Each structure stands twice: as structure tokens, then as C-alpha cells.
């Protein structure tokens, strides 16, 4: 349906509008040891940090949980071959070790640029963290995420000039991923999950029983818990054992059916503050994933 109540809203609002009144921002100098950087993420309760290159006098990139996972996986394999470098690596040296010729410059956005431009930048760059950087100051103000954006959209858009597509199902809109779902089992070692994250470039893994029914969820976010330990040697534990550390409490995994409306799914995701739902059949067998990446890509091209 529609041009879009959504597309219009996004084009008429500045990135500034989604910034909270107060926030914190952790920045790492690129000469910081990698092990110290990751502990600092845990310590500060933060999932991403801009990288400042002191020689160049500029931000050059981000360090996120994805990078922690790439490093941990490399560390685990290298240790088996008695190569123990990475953990005394500084951020600089790890970045040089991967981003060799393969250019990945820092992607950012002005506080005065549109929300539509922000969403498009997240999708196009296949990224989850978009620093809002004031061109006048050069100051990073805030790190924009899919979660924040969908919440803002849900809150500030009236319900009842309502697009026809909102009452259509995930099935008919074809929103989500429905093949080659990367999953683990209860007993799957952490190091195996890490290799899966590294190969598939996916933000969470459903945990399934012998019958392929979802019983838990191992997010990349559940992985930085490991940075709190001084040892790192406990990567042979099961994913189930690793998730005992998931502080809070756990109801079930948050799921949906293929035949629920886009509206119902957006509402569920925003209330839960979670990056994806697991798409499941009548019997809890996993059929796919519907991520905030999927939803925002749809809303930016109009539902579909």
C-alpha cells in the first residue's frame, strides 16, 4: 500500500530528533589493547564504540560485538596452533590484519540529515551502528540503531491514516528470511556458535532441540559476557551453559507466525526491545527469522 506515511515521516525528520536528552559514548583510541577495549564495552554496558586515530586526528571506524566475535574466533583457532598474538594486539593491529586492501571506511550521518537517509545507510552498508556526527564540531553525538528507529516510528506515527500493507501478513509481504537459517543445538559449544556467527554474518542463532523446535536464542549480545571473564578458556562450554549468564529473567523465546500482520509484528518487536523474532510453525519448529533489518528495509521501500 501507499507511498508511505512511513517514508514521508522519515524524510521529514532529522536524525537529531531521535537522540535522547542524555547519553553516554565510549570512544577508543586505536592504540588501545583489544582485550582492554572489549572489557570496557562490558564495563560501560555499551555494544559499540567509535575509533579515534590520534595520528590522523579523526574517527576511522567502529568496534562492535561483531568484531569481538571475529577476534575471539581467531584467538580460539590460533591457540590450537600455539599462536597467541591477538589478545595483546592493539585495535590498530587487528584492523590492519583484516581490513588490508579491503576498504571499509567509517560510515556516519549528520544530525541534520533525514531519518530516511539514516535507514538507507544502515541497509546499504549492512551495518547495525550508525554514529551521528556533528559536521561543525566533529563530535559524535549518538549511535543510531535499528531498534531505536523502529521504536521512534511506532511512537510518533498516528495509527489511523493506516497503510493497507500493515494489515497484510509476513507471508504475503515476503518480509523475513525463510531459508538457510543458521541455528545451534542445546549442547553446541560456544566456539562452534562463534564460527557460525563469523561465516553467516547474522545477529542471533536460534537454539533448537532434536526436533528442530526453538527452545532458546543465542544473540551476539550474549557473547560479550565472555569479555568479563579473565580467562577466555571457557569457550568449550555449551551455548545453554553460556546463557545462564544472561542476566534478567527469561520468558520463552519471542516468536511469531508467518501469518501475523506487519502491525502485530512491529508492535511485538517494539514492546520486547529485541532485534528479531523467530518465525515458527504451529509446533514451535523454526521456519525463519524476522529481523529489524527486514522490517526497516520493507518500510523504506514501502511494506513488501
Amino acid at each position: 500500500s501507499n507511498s508511505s506515511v512511513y517514508t514521508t515521516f522519515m524524510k521529514s525528520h532529522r536524525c537529531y530528533d531521535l537522540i535522547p536528552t542524555s547519553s553516554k559514548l565510549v570512544v577508543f583510541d586505536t592504540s588501545l589493547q583489544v582485550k582492554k577495549a572489549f572489557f570496557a564495552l562490558v564495563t560501560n554496558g555499551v555494544r559499540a564504540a567509535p575509533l579515534w586515530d590520534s595520528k590522523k586526528q579523526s574517527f576511522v571506524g567502529m568496534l562492535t560485538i561483531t568484531d569481538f566475535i571475529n577476534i575471539l574466533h581467531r584467538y580460539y583457532k590460533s591457540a590450537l596452533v600455539q599462536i597467541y598474538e591477538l589478545e595483546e594486539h592493539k585495535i590498530e593491529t587487528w584492523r590492519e590484519v583484516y581490513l588490508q586492501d579491503s576498504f571499509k571506511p567509517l560510515v556516519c550521518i549528520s544530525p541534520n540529515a533525514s531519518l530516511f537517509d539514516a535507514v538507507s545507510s544502515l541497509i546499504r552498508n549492512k551495518i547495525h551502528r550508525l554514529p551521528v556526527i556533528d559536521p561543525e564540531s566533529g563530535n559524535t553525538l549518538y549511535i543510531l540503531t535499528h531498534k531505536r528507529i523502529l521504536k521512534f516510528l511506532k511512537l510518533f506515527i498516528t495509527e489511523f491514516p493506516k497503510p493497507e500493507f500493515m494489515s497484510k501478513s509476513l507471508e504475503e509481504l515476503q518480509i523475513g528470511t525463510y531459508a538457510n537459517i543458521a541455528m545451534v543445538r542445546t549442547t553446541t559449544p560456544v566456539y562452534v556458535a562463534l564460527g557460525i556467527f563469523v561465516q553467516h554474518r547474522v545477529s542471533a542463532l536460534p537454539v533448537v532441540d532434536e526436533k528442530g523446535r526453538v527452545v532458546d536464542i543465542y544473540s551476539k549480545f550474549d557473547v560479550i559476557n565472555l569479555a568479563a571473564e579473565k580467562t577466555y578458556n571457557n569457550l568449550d562450554v555449551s551455548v545453554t551453559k553460556a546463557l545462564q549468564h544472561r542476566s534478567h529473567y527469561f520468558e520463552g523465546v519471542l516468536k511469531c507466525y508467518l501469518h501475523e500482520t506487519l502491525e502485530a509484528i512491529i508492535n511485538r518487536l517494539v514492546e520486547a526491545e529485541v532485534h528479531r523474532l523467530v518465525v515458527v510453525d504451529e509446533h514451535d519448529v523454526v521456519k525463519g527469522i524476522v529481523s529489524l533489518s527486514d522490517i526497516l528495509q520493507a518500510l523504506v521501500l514501502t511494506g513488501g
Binding site: 570512544v27 564495563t43 560501560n44 579515534w52 590520534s54 595520528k55 590522523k56 586526528q57 579523526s58 574517527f59 571506511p105 567509517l106 560510515v107 556516519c108 550521518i109 549528520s110 540529515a113 545507510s121 556526527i133 559536521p135 561543525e136 564540531s137 566533529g138 563530535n139 559524535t140
Partner: protein
């Protein structure tokens, strides 16, 4: 990151604190003006970026034995360009501290 301290503390003589910070400022090629005996306004040209950044230094007494040097940034007046006023304020502070203290 539990306990945050405002600037840095010293039990050195305040006369020695100011003398040394002025020495470090001169050594780093920053410009400065003395507002009060315990209050300096400093300005630095960034070598890489060519921009100017300003901050204030203020010495306070906190005990009968203890002084506190307070640093405050002064406000001015798709891939990023070089520069961040906030990060540069941090570097200015760290540079001044390194080259005058302990």
C-alpha cells in the same frame, strides 16, 4: 567506571603547580593568558587539522594540604572529516598533564 574524579589532585605547592603548568604549556607551543594567579585560558592550533581549540585551567584548594587542577573546554565562538572538539579537549588535557605533572 564507578568513581569519577574532577581533574587531578596534588599536594604540591600551588606556586609550583602553576609554574609547572605554564612551563608545560610553553613546551607544547600552546598559547595562554593568565586571568588570575590560579586561572589560565589556553589555546592550541591542531598540527594535523589546523583548527584552534580553547580550554580553561583553574586551581582549587580542597583540603589544607590538597589542591585540585580543574580543566574545562571552551565552546567555539558520507565519511567524517578530521577533528572532534571533544576528543581534542581530552588530548590537550592528557598532553598538558603528561608534560607537567608526576
Amino acid at each position: 567506571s564507578m568513581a569519577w574524579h574532577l581533574g587531578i589532585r596534588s599536594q604540591s605547592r600551588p606556586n609550583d603547580i602553576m609554574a609547572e603548568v605554564c612551563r608545560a604549556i610553553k613546551q607544547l607551543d600552546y598559547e595562554w593568558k593568565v586571568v588570575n594567579p590560579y586561572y589560565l585560558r589556553v589555546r592550541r592550533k591542531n598540527p594535523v587539522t589546523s583548527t584552534f581549540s580553547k580550554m580553561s585551567l583553574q586551581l582549587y584548594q580542597v583540603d589544607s594540604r590538597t589542591y585540585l587542577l580543574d580543566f574545562r573546554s571552551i565552546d567555539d565562538e558520507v565519511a567524517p572529516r578530521p577533528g572532534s572538539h571533544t576528543i581534542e579537549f581530552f588530548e590537550m588535557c592528557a598532553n598538558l598533564i603528561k608534560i607537567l605533572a608526576q
